[PDB]
């Protein structure tokens, strides 16, 4: 129960924003340029 | 005239499909066992 | 999942059951002696004695 | 509905446009690459798991 619950918490922290405009990587990649989108990626990088 | 709603006033929060899960949301809902107004 | 994998154990449940069956047959047919040296047979009333 | 969501923020199903058809989305398979070797002291043959 603890191992599956920690795995479910690790899955459920992927949908967290951590200050981003969206939590999924492909949407914030696909409508932003890279030199403005690098810090937008990097907040999700350090949170995950 | 006043009466009580039992479990009514629920709907779909985010126009999305979910199956065999339990989802918690924050949205405008009718509270359970509240005083609803009855008119004839 | 996305990046999460679960490795199976090296010992399967049949092999863990065969270890416990070997331990149970060893303790029933020899008492305590199979954990010390060779498994030396003894009647189970004299083992319990 | 148009698309189903998982407990994370990833899709699980989608309504197809131009046909109004429902399709299931599962990710294609992945896994780690484990290499079994006897060591370079014996042979350079390897087996890939
Ligand atoms: C580092 C190294 O060369 N290790 C061994 C060596 O000690 C041994 O003599 C030889 C014979 O199999 O195999 C190899």
Curated annotation (Swiss-Prot), chain A:
Task: Report the outcome of residue 17 to K.
Answer: In strain: Omicron/BA.1, Omicron/BA.2, Omicron/BA.2.12.1, Omicron/BA.2.75, Omicron/BA.4, Omicron/BA.5, Omicron/BQ.1.1, Omicron/XBB.1.5, Omicron/EG.5.1
What does the record list as coiled-coil region(s)? 1-41
- Described function: Subunit of the fusion protein that is processed upon entry into the host cell. Mediates fusion of the virion and cellular membranes by functioning as a class I viral fusion protein. Contains a viral fusion peptide that is unmasked after S2 cleavage. This cleavage can occur at the cell membrane by host TMPRSS2 or during endocytosis by host CSTL. In either case, this triggers an extensive and irreversible conformational change that leads to fusion of the viral envelope with the cellular cytoplasmic membrane, releasing viral genomic RNA into the host cell cytoplasm.
Q: What is this protein called?
A: Spike protein S2'
From which source organism is this entry?
Severe acute respiratory syndrome coronavirus 2 (2019-nCoV)
The range of the complete sequence contained here reads: 953 to 1000 of 1273
UniProtKB/Swiss-Prot annotation, chain B:
| Residue positions with a glycan | 35
Give the superkingdom in one word: Viruses
How does the record describe its quaternary structure? Binds to host ACE2. RBD also interacts with the N-linked glycan on 'Asn-90' of ACE2. Cleavage of S generates a polybasic C-terminal sequence on S1 that binds to host Neuropilin-1 (NRP1) and Neuropilin-2 (NRP2) receptors. Interacts with host integrin alpha-5/beta-1 (ITGA5:ITGB1) and with ACE2 in complex with integrin alpha-5/beta-1 (ITGA5:ITGB1). May interact via cytoplasmic c-terminus with M protein. May interact (via N-terminus) with host bilirubin and biliverdin, thereby preventing antibody binding to the SARS-CoV-2 spike NTD via an allosteric mechanism.
- Its biological purpose: Attaches the virion to the cell membrane by interacting with host receptor, initiating the infection. The major receptor is host ACE2. When S2/S2' has been cleaved, binding to the receptor triggers direct fusion at the cell membrane. When S2/S2' has not been cleaved, binding to the receptor results in internalization of the virus by endocytosis using host TFRC and GRM2 and leading to fusion of the virion membrane with the host endosomal membrane. Alternatively, may use NRP1/NRP2 and integrin as entry receptors.
List the protein's name: Spike protein S1
Q: Which residues of the full protein are shown?
A: 27 to 66 of 1273
